[PDB]
């Protein structure tokens, strides 16, 4: 039976329809237009400016007009709060709790919830599920979730952690290649937007680099990551609350330090080409690697070891310099990399870049959003 | 040659005089006897016994003057005066002999630490005046970390904030004292050392490569890093921002500095020993004290792990200051987290060590070595003086 997967983006809405792990139909929204891929042909259609639930509606309509029967719809919801400990098939109780999670991620959740609501209304005979990014980290203990602050603030700002579906998908895909049930894995979700690391013991999250918010942890494209806590306070005394929030989230990270780009590839280019901003670009790369390595080290001690270091996402799977720099700093722990394989790998498949003799293995593992949402559908429905 | 060391405290000023690594005179201002039908006084300990001079309540420079006067009247001649300055800012990459330039630069560092810097400054100014033919030096707590490179001092934020909020690091004098004391015991110049200053007030870790600070736990402020007695340490940067919205700026600063850390989580005490005691006696606050210990250990372990990767390995882990020297449960908790890295702890030595002297707690076969190293406040300032004047 057919599965429809929605992928909500900043300025777009993509979909893909699956039948037995095979793509039937696909396309995306945003002069704005919707593009469709069906029966081997490409249909582009001019549109006026749409919001997300309008785009979703139009996609459903196109599917109905072509008799693409749909039995399942999968959705991604970033921040499921304290309620959602696992992903869920969508009912009235789930819808209620989801709506209470809206203020948790005002940038992500609302447009995601909008698509869900319109999808439930336009496809009332289909079973629908929501894949929740924070759920995988429900195995993290109190002590690892707790910041050293007094009540009531202590319970208000517990750590949540994110990219949970990505981590869960990657772990699941490594089950034939390694023995996850007896393993210590550190996964690095290095993407555009958010980046994080996760310490995984026997297939389960033990700790992660993000916190109560998606600002915490690693240096990111435009986000500061972990910094001295008095700094946000001092900056507020200069420019106020909302401006500080904007700077730390949209004008920091690789962008703020390189003074060139939020894209690591542009940063690497400027360094290796020399280059009018190399200086700042070199600093941005060093600071990024430092924080990443520091994060890896901290997590390794928490989980009591390391068998496999995994890179995933866009940066993790397409930038060999990051993986090389990181493995060099972790060489003393027993990481012997194969540089021929590393420099050519773009992570289109699960590929080890480590010599088989190396004490700690290093691998790359794809985490395509659509396959990730679909995979959760399997777990919930068995299809 | 005698050396006068001033230790500026909160309610009083204390001092010691050294002659060849030994104390010949010492004292505390503003002393009170609860049964002594009497006034506040300076208590002097000199050779034989106790000398009490009744005084009004004294500030620090007033006490300093009267202390100097007492030593003159009792024929203790002074060749050097040592002082301690908490935050030297950008200018002080080294501790310094005090001249006109140094005094001018120290003056500009006052807003860095409104409480501690002016107190130590006032004592320095009066000390230069009452002993103007005496060489004096200021030991700067931030100077040891001048060797930390830009990438390690830099937070991933844009200009101009990036340069306004560079990392400094503290407990520098404690670290370089411990490192120096280790030169009689290990090859420091070819060593990777992580030191843990586990104090009653602030706490930090330092990654040390060949005798020099590579990176450290505190940042621009003395709030960053480890979970501390009353401080939060490193937390989600969004948390202070959201707390401002609830209770305002100044209240948040007070909460994170004075009502967090061990005190805030345990809901019992700021002292680790009381926390351990409550756990083991199963007091009414055992659950929260157990949580406070777990959170504290977790952050310390994570900090050590991060520093190890930064410096490229680990040969020697060293504990110092009050909690590091006199609380074996903390050391055990840490070493068990790191057993996988090659730490074989002699549990009998650890349970009996109070860190009165440098002694290894690990087996000599153990890949990574663990030791406790004393860092008495006065010897630390005195040692900086030996380095500057060769006394």
Coordinates of N, CA, C and O in Angstrom, one line a residue, chain A residues 123-225:
Chain A
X123 N -7.7 13.9 3.8 CA -7.5 12.5 3.7 C -8.0 11.8 5.0 O -7.2 11.2 5.7
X124 N -9.4 11.8 5.2 CA -9.9 11.3 6.5 C -10.0 9.7 6.6 O -10.4 9.2 7.6
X125 N -9.7 9.0 5.5 CA -9.8 7.6 5.5 C -8.4 6.9 5.7 O -8.3 5.7 5.9
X126 N -7.3 7.8 5.5 CA -6.0 7.3 5.6 C -5.5 7.3 7.1 O -6.0 8.0 7.9
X127 N -4.6 6.4 7.4 CA -3.9 6.4 8.7 C -2.7 7.3 8.6 O -2.0 7.3 7.6
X128 N -2.6 8.2 9.6 CA -1.4 9.1 9.6 C -0.6 9.1 10.9 O -1.2 8.8 12.0
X129 N 0.7 9.3 10.8 CA 1.6 9.3 11.9 C 2.5 10.5 11.9 O 2.7 11.1 10.9
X130 N 3.0 10.8 13.1 CA 3.9 11.9 13.2 C 5.2 11.4 13.8 O 5.3 10.8 14.9
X131 N 6.3 11.6 13.1 CA 7.7 11.3 13.5 C 8.3 12.4 14.3 O 8.4 13.5 13.8
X132 N 8.6 12.2 15.6 CA 9.0 13.2 16.5 C 10.5 13.2 16.9 O 11.0 12.3 17.4
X133 N 11.2 14.3 16.5 CA 12.6 14.4 16.6 C 13.2 14.3 18.0 O 14.4 13.9 18.2
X134 N 12.4 14.6 19.0 CA 12.9 14.7 20.4 C 12.7 13.3 21.1 O 13.2 13.1 22.2
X135 N 11.9 12.5 20.5 CA 11.5 11.2 21.2 C 12.6 10.2 21.4 O 12.7 9.6 22.5
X136 N 13.6 10.1 20.5 CA 14.7 9.2 20.6 C 15.5 9.4 21.8 O 16.2 8.5 22.3
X137 N 15.5 10.7 22.3 CA 16.3 11.1 23.5 C 15.6 10.9 24.8 O 16.1 11.4 25.8
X138 N 14.5 10.1 24.8 CA 13.7 9.9 26.0 C 14.4 8.9 26.9 O 14.0 8.7 28.1
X139 N 15.5 8.2 26.4 CA 16.2 7.3 27.2 C 17.3 7.9 28.0 O 18.0 7.3 28.8
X140 N 17.5 9.2 27.8 CA 18.5 10.0 28.6 C 18.1 10.2 30.0 O 16.9 10.6 30.3
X141 N 19.0 9.9 31.0 CA 18.6 10.0 32.4 C 18.5 11.4 32.9 O 18.8 12.4 32.2
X142 N 17.9 11.6 34.1 CA 17.6 12.9 34.7 C 18.9 13.7 34.9 O 19.0 14.9 34.5
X143 N 20.0 13.0 35.4 CA 21.2 13.7 35.6 C 21.9 14.3 34.3 O 22.5 15.3 34.4
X144 N 21.6 13.6 33.2 CA 22.2 14.1 31.9 C 21.3 15.2 31.3 O 21.7 15.9 30.4
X145 N 20.0 15.3 31.8 CA 19.1 16.3 31.3 C 19.1 17.6 32.2 O 18.5 18.6 31.7
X146 N 19.6 17.5 33.4 CA 19.5 18.5 34.4 C 20.7 19.5 34.3 O 21.8 19.1 34.4
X147 N 20.3 20.8 34.2 CA 21.3 21.8 34.4 C 21.4 22.2 35.8 O 20.5 22.2 36.6
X148 N 22.6 22.6 36.3 CA 22.9 22.9 37.7 C 22.3 24.3 38.1 O 23.0 25.2 38.5
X149 N 21.0 24.4 38.0 CA 20.2 25.6 38.4 C 19.1 25.2 39.4 O 18.7 24.0 39.4
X150 N 18.7 26.1 40.2 CA 17.7 25.7 41.3 C 16.3 25.6 40.7 O 16.0 26.2 39.6
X151 N 15.4 24.9 41.4 CA 14.0 25.0 41.0 C 13.5 26.4 41.3 O 14.1 27.1 42.1
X152 N 12.5 26.8 40.5 CA 11.7 26.1 39.6 C 12.3 26.1 38.2 O 11.8 25.3 37.3
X153 N 13.4 26.8 38.0 CA 14.0 26.9 36.6 C 14.6 25.6 36.2 O 14.6 25.3 35.0
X154 N 14.9 24.7 37.1 CA 15.5 23.4 36.8 C 14.6 22.6 36.0 O 15.0 22.0 35.0
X155 N 13.3 22.5 36.4 CA 12.4 21.6 35.7 C 11.8 22.3 34.5 O 11.3 21.7 33.6
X156 N 11.9 23.7 34.4 CA 11.4 24.4 33.3 C 12.3 24.3 32.1 O 11.9 24.2 30.9
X157 N 13.6 24.1 32.3 CA 14.6 24.1 31.2 C 15.4 22.8 31.2 O 16.7 22.8 31.3
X158 N 14.8 21.7 31.2 CA 15.4 20.4 31.0 C 15.9 20.3 29.6 O 15.4 20.9 28.7
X159 N 17.0 19.5 29.4 CA 17.5 19.2 28.1 C 16.6 18.3 27.3 O 15.9 17.4 27.9
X160 N 16.4 18.6 26.0 CA 15.6 17.7 25.2 C 16.4 17.0 24.2 O 16.3 15.8 24.0
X161 N 17.3 17.7 23.4 CA 18.0 17.1 22.4 C 17.2 16.9 21.1 O 16.0 16.7 21.2
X162 N 17.9 16.9 20.0 CA 17.2 16.9 18.7 C 17.8 16.0 17.7 O 18.7 15.3 18.0
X163 N 17.4 16.1 16.4 CA 17.9 15.3 15.3 C 17.7 13.8 15.7 O 18.5 12.9 15.2
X164 N 16.7 13.5 16.5 CA 16.5 12.1 17.0 C 16.1 11.1 16.0 O 16.5 9.9 16.1
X165 N 15.4 11.5 15.0 CA 15.0 10.6 13.9 C 16.2 10.2 13.0 O 16.4 9.1 12.7
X166 N 17.1 11.2 12.8 CA 18.3 11.0 12.0 C 19.2 10.0 12.7 O 19.6 9.0 12.1
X167 N 19.4 10.2 14.0 CA 20.2 9.3 14.8 C 19.6 7.9 14.8 O 20.3 6.9 14.7
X168 N 18.3 7.8 15.0 CA 17.6 6.5 15.1 C 17.6 5.8 13.7 O 17.9 4.5 13.7
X169 N 17.5 6.5 12.6 CA 17.6 5.9 11.3 C 19.0 5.4 11.0 O 19.1 4.2 10.5
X170 N 20.0 6.2 11.3 CA 21.4 5.8 11.1 C 21.7 4.5 11.9 O 22.3 3.6 11.4
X171 N 21.4 4.5 13.2 CA 21.6 3.3 14.1 C 20.9 2.1 13.5 O 21.5 1.0 13.4
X172 N 19.7 2.2 13.1 CA 18.9 1.1 12.5 C 19.6 0.6 11.2 O 19.6 -0.6 10.9
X173 N 20.2 1.5 10.4 CA 20.8 1.1 9.2 C 22.2 0.4 9.4 O 22.7 -0.2 8.4
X174 N 22.7 0.5 10.6 CA 24.0 -0.1 10.9 C 23.9 -1.5 11.5 O 24.9 -2.1 11.9
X175 N 22.7 -2.0 11.6 CA 22.4 -3.2 12.4 C 22.9 -4.5 11.7 O 23.1 -5.5 12.4
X176 N 23.1 -4.4 10.4 CA 23.6 -5.6 9.7 C 25.1 -5.5 9.5 O 25.7 -6.6 9.3
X177 N 25.6 -4.3 9.6 CA 27.1 -4.1 9.5 C 27.8 -4.3 10.8 O 28.9 -4.8 10.8
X178 N 27.3 -3.8 11.9 CA 27.9 -3.9 13.2 C 26.9 -4.5 14.2 O 25.7 -4.6 13.9
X179 N 27.4 -4.9 15.4 CA 26.5 -5.3 16.4 C 26.1 -4.1 17.4 O 26.9 -3.8 18.3
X180 N 25.1 -3.4 17.0 CA 24.7 -2.2 17.8 C 24.3 -2.6 19.2 O 24.4 -1.7 20.1
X181 N 23.8 -3.8 19.5 CA 23.3 -4.2 20.8 C 24.4 -4.2 21.8 O 24.1 -4.2 23.0
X182 N 25.6 -4.3 21.4 CA 26.8 -4.2 22.3 C 27.8 -3.2 21.7 O 28.8 -3.7 21.1
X183 N 27.5 -2.0 21.7 CA 28.3 -1.0 21.1 C 28.3 0.4 21.7 O 27.3 0.8 22.4
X184 N 29.4 1.2 21.6 CA 29.4 2.6 22.0 C 29.7 3.4 20.8 O 30.8 3.4 20.2
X185 N 28.7 4.2 20.4 CA 28.7 4.9 19.1 C 28.6 6.4 19.4 O 27.7 6.8 20.2
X186 N 29.4 7.2 18.8 CA 29.2 8.7 18.8 C 28.8 9.1 17.4 O 29.6 9.0 16.5
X187 N 27.6 9.6 17.2 CA 27.1 10.1 15.9 C 27.2 11.6 15.9 O 26.8 12.3 16.8
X188 N 27.6 12.1 14.7 CA 27.7 13.5 14.5 C 26.7 13.9 13.4 O 27.0 13.6 12.2
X189 N 25.7 14.6 13.7 CA 24.7 15.1 12.7 C 25.2 16.5 12.3 O 24.8 17.5 12.8
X190 N 26.1 16.6 11.3 CA 26.6 17.8 10.8 C 25.9 18.3 9.6 O 26.1 17.9 8.5
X191 N 24.9 19.2 9.8 CA 24.1 19.7 8.7 C 24.2 21.2 8.5 O 24.8 21.9 9.3
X192 N 23.5 21.7 7.5 CA 23.2 23.1 7.4 C 22.1 23.3 8.4 O 21.3 22.4 8.7
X193 N 21.9 24.5 8.9 CA 21.0 24.7 10.0 C 21.6 24.2 11.3 O 22.6 24.7 11.8
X194 N 20.9 23.2 11.9 CA 21.4 22.7 13.2 C 22.4 21.6 13.0 O 22.4 20.8 12.1
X195 N 23.4 21.5 13.9 CA 24.3 20.4 14.0 C 24.4 19.9 15.5 O 24.3 20.7 16.4
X196 N 24.5 18.6 15.7 CA 24.6 18.1 17.0 C 25.4 16.7 17.1 O 25.6 16.1 16.0
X197 N 25.8 16.3 18.3 CA 26.4 15.0 18.5 C 25.6 14.2 19.5 O 24.9 14.8 20.4
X198 N 25.6 12.9 19.4 CA 24.9 12.1 20.3 C 25.7 10.9 20.8 O 26.4 10.2 19.9
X199 N 25.7 10.6 22.1 CA 26.4 9.4 22.6 C 25.4 8.3 22.7 O 24.4 8.4 23.5
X200 N 25.6 7.2 22.0 CA 24.7 6.1 21.9 C 25.2 4.8 22.5 O 26.2 4.3 22.0
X201 N 24.6 4.3 23.5 CA 25.0 3.1 24.2 C 24.0 1.9 23.8 O 22.8 2.0 24.2
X202 N 24.5 0.9 23.2 CA 23.7 -0.2 22.8 C 22.4 0.1 22.0 O 21.4 -0.5 22.2
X203 N 22.6 1.1 21.1 CA 21.5 1.5 20.3 C 20.6 2.6 20.9 O 19.7 3.1 20.2
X204 N 20.9 3.1 22.1 CA 20.0 4.1 22.7 C 20.8 5.3 23.1 O 22.0 5.3 23.5
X205 N 20.1 6.5 23.0 CA 20.7 7.8 23.3 C 21.1 7.8 24.8 O 20.3 7.3 25.7
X206 N 22.2 8.3 25.1 CA 22.7 8.4 26.5 C 22.9 9.9 26.8 O 22.5 10.3 27.9
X207 N 23.4 10.6 25.9 CA 23.5 12.1 26.0 C 23.7 12.7 24.6 O 24.1 12.1 23.6
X208 N 23.4 14.0 24.5 CA 23.4 14.7 23.2 C 24.0 16.1 23.5 O 24.0 16.6 24.6
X209 N 24.4 16.8 22.4 CA 25.0 18.1 22.5 C 24.1 19.3 22.6 O 24.4 20.4 23.1
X210 N 22.8 19.1 22.1 CA 21.8 20.1 22.2 C 21.2 20.1 23.6 O 21.3 19.1 24.3
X211 N 20.5 21.2 24.0 CA 19.9 21.3 25.3 C 18.4 21.5 25.3 O 17.7 20.8 24.7
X212 N 18.0 22.5 26.1 CA 16.6 22.9 26.1 C 16.2 23.5 24.7 O 15.1 23.4 24.3
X213 N 17.2 24.2 24.1 CA 17.0 24.9 22.9 C 17.9 24.3 21.8 O 18.8 23.5 22.1
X214 N 17.7 24.7 20.5 CA 18.5 24.3 19.4 C 19.7 25.2 19.2 O 20.4 25.1 18.1
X215 N 20.1 26.0 20.2 CA 21.2 26.9 20.1 C 22.4 26.3 20.7 O 23.6 26.6 20.4
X216 N 22.2 25.3 21.7 CA 23.2 24.8 22.5 C 24.2 23.8 21.8 O 23.8 23.2 20.8
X217 N 25.4 23.7 22.3 CA 26.3 22.6 21.8 C 27.4 23.1 20.8 O 28.2 23.9 21.1
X218 N 27.3 22.5 19.6 CA 28.3 22.7 18.6 C 28.2 24.1 17.9 O 27.2 24.7 17.9
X219 N 29.4 24.5 17.4 CA 29.3 25.7 16.5 C 28.6 25.2 15.2 O 28.8 24.1 14.7
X220 N 27.6 26.1 14.8 CA 26.8 25.7 13.6 C 27.0 26.8 12.5 O 27.8 27.7 12.6
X221 N 26.1 26.6 11.4 CA 26.2 27.6 10.3 C 26.0 29.0 10.8 O 26.9 29.8 10.5
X222 N 25.0 29.3 11.5 CA 24.7 30.7 12.0 C 24.5 30.7 13.5 O 24.1 31.8 14.1
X223 N 24.7 29.6 14.2 CA 24.4 29.6 15.7 C 25.7 29.4 16.5 O 26.6 28.7 16.1
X224 N 25.7 30.0 17.7 CA 26.9 30.1 18.5 C 27.3 28.8 19.1 O 28.5 28.6 19.4
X225 N 26.4 28.0 19.5 CA 26.6 26.8 20.3 C 26.9 27.2 21.7 O 26.5 28.3 22.2

